[PDB]
Task: inverse folding
DNA sequence: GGCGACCCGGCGCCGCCTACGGTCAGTACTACGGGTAGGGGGTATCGGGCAACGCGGCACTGAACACCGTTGTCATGTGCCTTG
């Protein structure tokens, strides 16, 4: 949590370096975008021991959330081809990404 | 003011080996952009199958000489007959 706070501070100094009053709004609408950017980058870059690249990271999170949506809607484990279709990828890429998203066990 | 309690911290330990043990966890997104390790073809260099060309024993063209062996040969010596 506290490292996330520091990374948000980093995004804040970045955003205020790139803010001007020309925008006809408050700070809270401009800075928050860059804070979100910095936190997302940190969570994608230094979260996993076996580091994944950013593109694969968003692949993992998209797969996880859409799979959770499938479970919520259908209430059953969807067929691999079904998940492949909602993702539009192939089943081979599906098993690949599923294996790439594990965590080390101590 | 140093003692004194007490108070707390603070640690530190709590005995030796042996069989097997069962599993799973929630809230971004796109977009570009470079740059690649992988997909291709074509080329230069090194790495295989048949003959290569030696050698050597001996062996023959036997040729040309050598080594005994031999009956060629013979001008020159004994024995009998005729005459001094």
Result:
């Amino acid at each position: 949590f506290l490292d996330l706070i520091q990374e948000g501070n980093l995004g804040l100094i970045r955003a205020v370096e790139k803010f001007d009053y020309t925008k006809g709004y408050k700070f809270s609408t401009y800075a928050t975008w860059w804070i979100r950017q910095a936190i997302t980058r940190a969570m994608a870059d230094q979260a996993r021991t076996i580091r994944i690249p950013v593109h694969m990271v968003e692949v993992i999170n998209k797969l996880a959330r859409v799979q959770r949506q499938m479970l919520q809607d259908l209430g059953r484990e969807p067929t691999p081809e079904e998940l492949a279709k909602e993702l539009d990828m192939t089943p081979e890429k599906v098993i690949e990404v599923q294996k790439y998203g594990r965590e080390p066990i101590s």
